[PDB]
């Protein structure tokens, strides 16, 4: 079973992303808080793989507890919300160096979440209230190259847009 660990700031929507992916439908009105360690049967490139997904929601503020999830990881998804520049910055400041410290050889995919909101008018105006703007694709590709990520991928847990490709690319980044 491939080990895919999801790392990133709270309010990236890690739990939401994983739930939406694994259950094939955005949960809707209520987004669950808990995602148990999951093992799915995924079909990638005509071959069946066994994808084990591990969520880290809650451990974001507890630095000595986090590393316990890292041993034996096959691929990390470092996540940031495309409508939260802070969480983007923390790709550089907090998550990449930590993941690289405990796992220097394990592949890293930079995943931008909440794609559905990057051009959502209300969100953009609200961001502009605090002199901020959503992360654009080139910015994120730059970030991905900087930390030497195997890939940069955007997606939306709501619309499922580009969601399948994230975990397919994880599986592909492990097998090869």
């Amino acid at each position: 079973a491939i080990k895919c660990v999801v790392v990133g700031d709270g309010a990236v929507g890690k739990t939401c992303l994983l739930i939406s992916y694994t259950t094939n439908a955005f949960p809707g009105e209520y987004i669950p808080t808990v995602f148990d360690n999951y093992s799915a049967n995924v079909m990638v490139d005509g071959k069946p793989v066994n994808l084990g997904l591990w969520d880290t929601a809650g451990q974001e503020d507890y630095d000595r507890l986090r590393p316990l999830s890292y041993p034996q990881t096959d691929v990390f998804l470092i996540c940031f919300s495309l409508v939260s520049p802070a969480s983007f910055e923390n790709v550089r400041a907090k998550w990449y160096p930590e993941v690289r410290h405990h796992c220097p050889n394990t592949p890293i995919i930079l995943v931008g979440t909440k794609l559905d909101l990057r051009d959502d008018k209300d969100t953009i105006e609200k961001l502009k209230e605090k002199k901020l703007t959503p992360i654009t694709y080139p910015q994120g590709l730059a970030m991905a190259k900087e930390i030497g990520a195997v890939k940069y991928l955007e997606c939306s847990a709501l619309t499922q847009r580009g969601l399948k490709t994230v975990f397919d690319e994880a599986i592909r980044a492990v097998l090869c």
Binding site: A1, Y30, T33, G52
Partner: protein, 344 residues
Amino acid sequence: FAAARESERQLRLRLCVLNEILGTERDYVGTLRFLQSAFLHRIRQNVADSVEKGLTEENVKVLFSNIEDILEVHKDFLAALEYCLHPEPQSQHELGNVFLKFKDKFCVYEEYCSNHEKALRLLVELNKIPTVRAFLLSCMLLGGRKTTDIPLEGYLLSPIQRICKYPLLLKELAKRTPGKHPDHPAVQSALQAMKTVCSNINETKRQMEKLEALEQLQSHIEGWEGSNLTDICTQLLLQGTLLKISAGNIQERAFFLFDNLLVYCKRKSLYIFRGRINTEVMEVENVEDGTADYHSNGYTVTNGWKIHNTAKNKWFVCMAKTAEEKQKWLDAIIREREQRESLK
């Protein structure tokens, strides 16, 4: 009446959160009971087969730690939850107080998480032994789980994750609890409390890691004299390269201040042992800038102080390059004393 829809939405969601807290508590207790049943009960029912396959009692002890104490606590916690949410979860129910009641019982996690690093690393070694991997997998199978599922490592990881889940569940529950709602202050209290529980686990593991650093430091020092660092100390407070002036020979030496101890070494195993002072049989006299007396070999002392090893009648001088490095060291030693004196 649009607000009539909004308040009802808040409660609809609050109910969702309560149901999640309860259901996932049930799942978690279920998991703990699996770990107990498939492994521990099985190993105890036949301890001889366990041993003759490769699992010593020390191994099981390090592997599963105090998972059963955690289980006990969650049987009680869950019972309390079910009682609080009777006959089913409903919006007006108040869960804050339950958490608050158990805020102190959760300390059992501190032992467990601190141990987990040691556990999984050991597990990596145990999976190298063929018959032991065989055994652990058999335990997984008889427990109703498969080999194409999450491996044992994840179940062993699950409590860390779970204890870290409560502040989230409570933040969301608080988000769905109106100001006038009776549960409100108790929920916010529960949030702060569980956050403190988690932080406490974190710090416990941190300061236990400092010990690993004491052992590793002692290993890197050649020709160690006296008792072990992990025997008499808890953490390194300060290290740096200073100028040491004995009676008749001057060299630069690397200093290490621990709680209860002061060590100095010769930089090259990165270091070579040169000396140790117990800090209560130590005295610090200040030297004023431009002083040149017997101990300093008649050298001009600036940014310097005298260290009296009273247990050996020995004085010597320490000098730091910059004016501030001095203050850093002096306050470090004053800190060490105040804390050691306070501990009594």
